Amino acid sequence: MQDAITAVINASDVQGKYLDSSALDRLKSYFQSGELRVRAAATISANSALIVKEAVAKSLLYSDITRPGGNMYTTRRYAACIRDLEYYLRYATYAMLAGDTSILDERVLNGLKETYNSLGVPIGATVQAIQAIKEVTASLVGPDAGREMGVYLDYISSGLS
Amino acid sequence: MQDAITAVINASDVQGKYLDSSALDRLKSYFQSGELRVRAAATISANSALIVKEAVAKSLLYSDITRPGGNMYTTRRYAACIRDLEYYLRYATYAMLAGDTSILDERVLNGLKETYNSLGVPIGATVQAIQAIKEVTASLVGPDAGREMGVYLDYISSGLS
Amino acid sequence: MQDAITAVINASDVQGKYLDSSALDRLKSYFQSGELRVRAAATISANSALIVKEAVAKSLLYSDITRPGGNMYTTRRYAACIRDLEYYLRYATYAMLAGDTSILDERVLNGLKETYNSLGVPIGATVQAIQAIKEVTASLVGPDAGREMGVYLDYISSGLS
Amino acid sequence: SIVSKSIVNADAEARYLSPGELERIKTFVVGGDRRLRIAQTIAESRERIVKQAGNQLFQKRPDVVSPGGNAYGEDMTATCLRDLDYYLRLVTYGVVSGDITPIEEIGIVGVREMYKSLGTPIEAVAEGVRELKSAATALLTGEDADEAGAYFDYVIGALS
Amino acid sequence: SIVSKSIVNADAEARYLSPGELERIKTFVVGGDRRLRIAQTIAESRERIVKQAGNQLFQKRPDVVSPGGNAYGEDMTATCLRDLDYYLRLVTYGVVSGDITPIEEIGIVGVREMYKSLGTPIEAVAEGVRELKSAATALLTGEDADEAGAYFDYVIGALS
Amino acid sequence: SIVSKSIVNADAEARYLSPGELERIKTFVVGGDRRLRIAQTIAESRERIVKQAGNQLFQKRPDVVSPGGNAYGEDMTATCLRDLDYYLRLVTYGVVSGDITPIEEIGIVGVREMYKSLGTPIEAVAEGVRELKSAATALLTGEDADEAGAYFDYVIGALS
Numbered sequence: 001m002q003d004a005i006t007a008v009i010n011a012s013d014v015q016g017k018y019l020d021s022s023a024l025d026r027l028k029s030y031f032q033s034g035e036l037r038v039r040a041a042a043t044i045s046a047n048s049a050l051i052v053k054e055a056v057a058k059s060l061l062y063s064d065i066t067r068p069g070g071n072m073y074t075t076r077r078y079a080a081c082i083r084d085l086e087y088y089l090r091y092a093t094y095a096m097l098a099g100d101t102s103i104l105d106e107r108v109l110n111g112l113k114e115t116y117n118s119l120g121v122p123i124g125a126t127v128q129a130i131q132a133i134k135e136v137t138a139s140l141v142g143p144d145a146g147r148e149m150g151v152y153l154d155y156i157s158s159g160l161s
Numbered sequence: 162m163q164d165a166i167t168a169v170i171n172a173s174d175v176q177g178k179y180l181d182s183s184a185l186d187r188l189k190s191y192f193q194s195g196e197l198r199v200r201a202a203a204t205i206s207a208n209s210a211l212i213v214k215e216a217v218a219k220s221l222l223y224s225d226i227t228r229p230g231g232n233m234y235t236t237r238r239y240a241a242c243i244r245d246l247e248y249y250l251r252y253a254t255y256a257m258l259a260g261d262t263s264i265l266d267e268r269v270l271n272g273l274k275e276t277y278n279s280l281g282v283p284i285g286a287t288v289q290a291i292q293a294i295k296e297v298t299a300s301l302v303g304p305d306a307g308r309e310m311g312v313y314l315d316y317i318s319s320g321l322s
Numbered sequence: 323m324q325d326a327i328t329a330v331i332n333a334s335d336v337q338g339k340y341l342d343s344s345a346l347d348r349l350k351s352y353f354q355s356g357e358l359r360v361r362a363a364a365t366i367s368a369n370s371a372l373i374v375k376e377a378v379a380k381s382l383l384y385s386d387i388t389r390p391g392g393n394m395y396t397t398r399r400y401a402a403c404i405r406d407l408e409y410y411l412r413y414a415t416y417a418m419l420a421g422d423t424s425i426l427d428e429r430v431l432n433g434l435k436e437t438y439n440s441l442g443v444p445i446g447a448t449v450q451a452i453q454a455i456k457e458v459t460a461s462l463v464g465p466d467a468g469r470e471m472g473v474y475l476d477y478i479s480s481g482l483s
Numbered sequence: 484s485i486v487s488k489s490i491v492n493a494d495a496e497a498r499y500l501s502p503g504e505l506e507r508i509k510t511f512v513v514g515g516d517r518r519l520r521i522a523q524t525i526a527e528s529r530e531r532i533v534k535q536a537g538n539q540l541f542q543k544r545p546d547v548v549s550p551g552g553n554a555y556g557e558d559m560t561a562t563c564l565r566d567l568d569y570y571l572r573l574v575t576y577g578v579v580s581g582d583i584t585p586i587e588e589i590g591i592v593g594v595r596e597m598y599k600s601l602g603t604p605i606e607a608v609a610e611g612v613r614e615l616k617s618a619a620t621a622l623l624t625g626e627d628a629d630e631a632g633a634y635f636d637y638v639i640g641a642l643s
Numbered sequence: 644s645i646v647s648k649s650i651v652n653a654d655a656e657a658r659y660l661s662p663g664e665l666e667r668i669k670t671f672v673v674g675g676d677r678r679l680r681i682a683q684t685i686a687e688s689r690e691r692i693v694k695q696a697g698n699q700l701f702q703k704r705p706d707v708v709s710p711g712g713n714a715y716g717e718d719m720t721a722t723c724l725r726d727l728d729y730y731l732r733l734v735t736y737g738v739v740s741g742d743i744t745p746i747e748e749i750g751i752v753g754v755r756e757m758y759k760s761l762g763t764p765i766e767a768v769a770e771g772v773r774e775l776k777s778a779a780t781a782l783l784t785g786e787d788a789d790e791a792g793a794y795f796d797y798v799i800g801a802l803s
Numbered sequence: 804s805i806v807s808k809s810i811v812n813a814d815a816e817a818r819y820l821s822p823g824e825l826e827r828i829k830t831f832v833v834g835g836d837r838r839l840r841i842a843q844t845i846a847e848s849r850e851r852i853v854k855q856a857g858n859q860l861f862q863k864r865p866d867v868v869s870p871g872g873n874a875y876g877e878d879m880t881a882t883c884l885r886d887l888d889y890y891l892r893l894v895t896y897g898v899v900s901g902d903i904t905p906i907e908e909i910g911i912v913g914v915r916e917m918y919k920s921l922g923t924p925i926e927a928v929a930e931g932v933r934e935l936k937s938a939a940t941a942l943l944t945g946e947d948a949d950e951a952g953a954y955f956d957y958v959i960g961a962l963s
């Protein structure tokens with residue numbers, strides 16, 4: 001993984017130059033938004049269980065998905081799916097802190113779509129669940145930090161499609 | 162790795178159904194065919210070395226395959242080929258006892274066809290030996306159990322094509 | 323891996339023949355050039371670090387490659403390039419002593435042309451550099467053995483061409 | 484079942500089935516009928532078993548069906564009773580196969596994470612299965628009761 | 644950085660950051676400005692620095708540029724100062740990330756290999772960085788100076 | 804051969820051939836002709852060697868050739884003597900490469916499993932090769948007999 005900081009540094013080293021003013025600006029913008037990210041993380045951490053429960057009951061529990069035969073059917077798969085949502089929330093919370101999505105590409109998305117495909121895990125329903133998480137966390141984190149988390153929750157989402 | 166009984170159970174669970182009378186009948190027959198299976202497998206076990214032997218003798222020996230240049234040349238490949246025939250025989254009798262081919266698909270055919278194509282192993286000849294094994298075993302196990310072993314030995318060679 | 327001795331043994335084994343008249347000739351002439359290949363394998367070893375250092379100069383230096391954004395930039399990549407140059411030199415020597423390219427096919431070229439393009443290594447450069455190894459090494463050993471080392475170094479280039 | 488279990492053993496050791504393993508297949512198979520009888524009678528009175536298990540359960544768990552409870556409301560109490568039917572069906576799959584590999588894979592693995600996110604008191608679901616147990620066994624005679632009851636016991640212990 | 648690092652620690656134990664890590668992030672993020680000023684002042688005077696530290700490097704190791712030297716000939720001395728300028732840059736990268744990681748992956752991993760094959764004396768490159776340290780901290784006062792200097796040390800120490 | 808063996812080790816240690824591995828290669832090649840000669844001496848009396856061994860084998864062990872023994876009949880004794888020809892051919896391969904990898908990969912790996920199901924008594928095959936050994940070393944001078952003999956014994960031990 002890589003911070004937005006290291007992200008900026010690398011973008012400059014690839015050009016063999018010291019940090020531009022445009023580079024210092026990216027850096028300044030990341031630093032001043034730190035408190036907001038940490039505070040968001042602290043909340044998303046003390047509420048990770050509730051955020052998942054509510055998003056499940058508000059997206060997935062309004063669909064046929066658990067009727068036997070269902071992809072969400074059997075206690076094993078139910079938990080398997082709840083566990084994925086937890087992963088999304090945690091790693092999206094990993095990414096927001098970092099202001100970079102490299103952790104998602106490296107630890108969450110690599111071969112994720114192919115695995116779901118050969119498993120029959122519906123991508124449509126997972127995407128809908130993630131959006132429910134986007135929404136439920138925004139209500140706890142505020143509109144400002146909510147939008148920032150959305151970026152990362154969306155990223156995972158638009159990576160499986 | 163599934164059992165016939167388990168196959169029947171999963172078929173109705175995907176439907177959220179209790180075992181129905183025809184389903185019970187499926188199980189009834191599997192049970193009724195029980196001792197005949199646990200017996201053919203008994204004689205087979207005792208003549209496994211002989212079976213493969215008569216199969217090779219009528220199938221491969223003294224031909225292009227064994228002479229320098231064939232895939233059964235060198236003691237190395239000869240044994241490797243006897244070994245495969247001992248494998249099919251054993252795994253076919255396993256399946257029979259189970260009344261389910263899931264075992265073969267998991268422990269036997271997974272990737273076999275490639276693995277052979279990349280080694281120059283003759284698909285049609287190995288199939289010829291499978292014909293021989295089907296024949297020798299049926300002549301020890303009796304007509305009824307012989308066709309019962311022919312379904313699984315057929316499932317294998319046909320999975321090579 | 324395989325040397326010329328085995329190559330001949332096998333060519334005859336596939337036909338069930340004893341050493342063939344031609345095979346003894348092939349074999350015998352491989353023995354006669356044994357001492358030359360050893361003498362050459364010695365000087366190449368004693369001047370390996372030098373061979374590479376000079377080749378890099380007449381080849382991979384003061385070009386665009388080592389500047390920021392090119393593939394030699396960063397003391398990490400620069401080192402990685404020289405490392406690969408040593409492998410070709412050493413493996414070419416291995417291949418020269420054996421009189422068989424199998425060791426290059428098995429330990430050097432396999433899924434190498436891919437890995438390169440994956441990490442965006444500049445194939446045409448690594449080849450212009452290799453070429454320099456042939457000339458530098460040739461001048462030290464001799465066009466007699468340089469002759470044979472050229473045949474093998476060129477063999478690695480083509481495995482990339 | 485004992486069939487695939489025996490195969491799994493033998494295959495791991497790369498051998499044919501032992502004489503002990505074949506004997507057990509015979510024993511298990513010869514008794515297959517009795518087992519189907521049990522699944523059969525449980526199934527034919529599934530409605531009465533659950534409905535009756537649900538009553539005694541709410542009678543002892545009035546807090547689960549009273550305001551604030553997890554199974555409060557006809558929509559919740561309905562689903563709750565449907566979980567009871569779920570486990571009852573699972574127990575019949577066990578008796579038939581004489582194996583718990585079915586009950587485990589369908590309704591045990593991840594069962595605690597599942598109910599904790601629905602906010603359902605597992606103890607309560609365990610007590611519910613205790614109600615299904617007596618309600619069902621009662622319908623069976625003799626040793627058929629002790630057979631079906633061992634599986635209910637399995638599910639009970641798994642839910643606590 | 645101190646953000647990417649603590650995220651790894653957390654990922655490794657499959658949990659959310661600790662109050663200690665979040666707090667450490669707040670302290671780092673808060674002082675981000677100072678780090679930028681420091682790197683800015685250094686960038687702005689890169690040509691003073693690299694040229695000054697270069698003269699001192701020669702007046703101490705006059706051999707390097709003497710005949711049969713690694714940097715003999717304007718062409719060659721030119722490249723030598725370019726390297727001092729490369730390392731002065733990487734140092735600003737550490738200051739801003741307060742992480743040594745970027746100096747390593749860019750100009751430390753594989754250095755000996757590189758300079759060995761170019762016939763350059765690594766211990767000579769080191770003191771050129773020792774001189775650079777002097778010409779740079781020179782423009783810095785106090786804490787701003789101790790901060791930069793610490794990274795110069797790391798580089799100096801990884802090259803000796 | 805010795806050449807590919809040294810390549811193998813030096814490659815496992817990422818290094819060039821040691822002075823010791825080079826001396827051996829020098830010496831192994833300088834003795835090339837000696838080896839060829841030995842092979843030709845055997846190869847040219849193929850038939851004489853094989854048929855004699857058969858004669859002796861058969862007298863010492865009139866079993867394999869009596870009714871009920873693996874080589875009874877003319878076809879069958881002929882396939883046996885063909886097998887003794889194979890092994891004599893593999894021997895020249897070893898004495899030629901001063902290495903036993905060829906005898907191994909061609910007639911040793913899997914040989915017990917091959918003959919066992921073929922109903923061939925392998926102690927007897929070893930017997931034949933023993934006669935082969937004497938029939939062949941009989942036509943060689945001293946040193947040459949010590950060499951050829953070594954490869955014969957390797958085969959023997961492996962088949963017994």
Ligand SMILES: *[C@H](C)[C@H]1/C(=C/c2[nH]c(/C=C3N=C(/C=C4\NC(=O)C(CC)=C4C)C(C)=C\3CCC(=O)O)c(CCC(=O)O)c2C)NC(=O)[C@@H]1C
Pocket residue numbers: 061066067072073074075078547552553554555559560562563564566567569570589590601602603604607608611
């Ligand atoms: C009844 C004794 C208790 C009770 C039950 C209750 N359950 C739910 C919701 C669900 N239960 C399941 C259970 C399973 N799904 C499976 O695939 C299997 C394996 C066969 C089982 C056992 C599921 C998936 C749900 C989710 C909804 C759905 O049907 O998919 C509820 C609803 C909870 C809510 O709305 O929040 C209730 C009330 N509750 C009790 O208090 C009793 C002790």
Ligand SMILES: *[C@H](C)[C@H]1/C(=C/c2[nH]c(/C=C3N=C(/C=C4\NC(=O)C(CC)=C4C)C(C)=C\3CCC(=O)O)c(CCC(=O)O)c2C)NC(=O)[C@@H]1C
Pocket residue numbers: 065071072077078080081082084085087107108109112115119121122125126129
């Ligand atoms: C939930 C919204 C949906 C759902 C999920 C579901 N997922 C699986 C199985 C797997 N999920 C993953 C994903 C990850 N593993 C990880 O370690 C991480 C961290 C980066 C992720 C994102 C993997 C690897 C698997 C396969 C391995 C396994 O089973 O654990 C299942 C199981 C499917 C099955 O048949 O067994 C399910 C059900 N299913 C849904 O219906 C929802 C829409």
Ligand SMILES: *[C@H](C)[C@H]1/C(=C/c2[nH]c(/C=C3N=C(/C=C4\NC(=O)C(CC)=C4C)C(C)=C\3CCC(=O)O)c(CCC(=O)O)c2C)NC(=O)[C@@H]1C
Pocket residue numbers: 221226231232233237238239241242243245246248268269273276280282283286287290
């Ligand atoms: C015999 C009738 C024919 C024949 C066979 C032959 N097979 C191989 C090599 C392999 N066979 C397998 C298959 C399996 N391995 C398993 O563990 C299992 C499940 C228990 C199966 C089904 C594999 C994996 C290999 C390759 C690895 C290996 O050699 O063990 C060979 C070897 C070829 C070679 O060494 O180059 C041969 C000769 N060949 C014939 O000519 C017959 C028609």
Ligand SMILES: *[C@H](C)[C@H]1/C(=C/c2[nH]c(/C=C3N=C(/C=C4\NC(=O)C(CC)=C4C)C(C)=C\3CCC(=O)O)c(CCC(=O)O)c2C)NC(=O)[C@@H]1C
Pocket residue numbers: 382383384385388389394395396397400700707708712713714719720722723724726727729730733749750757761763764767768771
């Ligand atoms: C100066 C203090 C000393 C000195 C320097 C010197 N360096 C070179 C050549 C090269 N230096 C590098 C260094 C780097 N490349 C990187 O990516 C990084 C990370 C930021 C570093 C530090 C490289 C790649 C070269 C190769 C030349 C090129 O750019 O292609 C030379 C030239 C050697 C030659 O003759 O080719 C010199 C002289 N030499 C000294 O004596 C000083 C002590």
Ligand SMILES: *[C@H](C)[C@H]1/C(=C/c2[nH]c(/C=C3N=C(/C=C4\NC(=O)C(CC)=C4C)C(C)=C\3CCC(=O)O)c(CCC(=O)O)c2C)NC(=O)[C@@H]1C
Pocket residue numbers: 382387393394399400402403404406407409429430434437441443444447448451
């Ligand atoms: C030098 C002439 C050019 C150059 C080289 C370069 N190579 C790599 C990376 C790798 N090279 C290999 C190749 C081998 N590894 C082996 O073990 C063997 C023999 C068995 C070979 C042939 C591999 C595996 C890698 C990747 C793993 C690693 O980094 O070691 C790089 C690095 C690329 C990167 O971005 O990390 C480079 C730079 N590059 C050039 O520009 C020259 C023209």
Ligand SMILES: *[C@H](C)[C@H]1/C(=C/c2[nH]c(/C=C3N=C(/C=C4\NC(=O)C(CC)=C4C)C(C)=C\3CCC(=O)O)c(CCC(=O)O)c2C)NC(=O)[C@@H]1C
Pocket residue numbers: 221222223224227228233234235236239867868872873874879880882883884886887889890909910921923924927928931
């Ligand atoms: C003679 C000393 C003994 C003997 C031999 C005998 N052999 C066979 C049949 C076969 N022998 C082989 C042998 C090899 N195949 C190989 O690839 C190699 C390595 C180069 C060897 C040594 C094979 C493959 C066969 C099968 C038939 C064929 O050639 O395809 C027989 C016939 C067995 C039969 O009836 O089917 C006999 C008799 N028998 C003895 O009693 C002697 C001790």
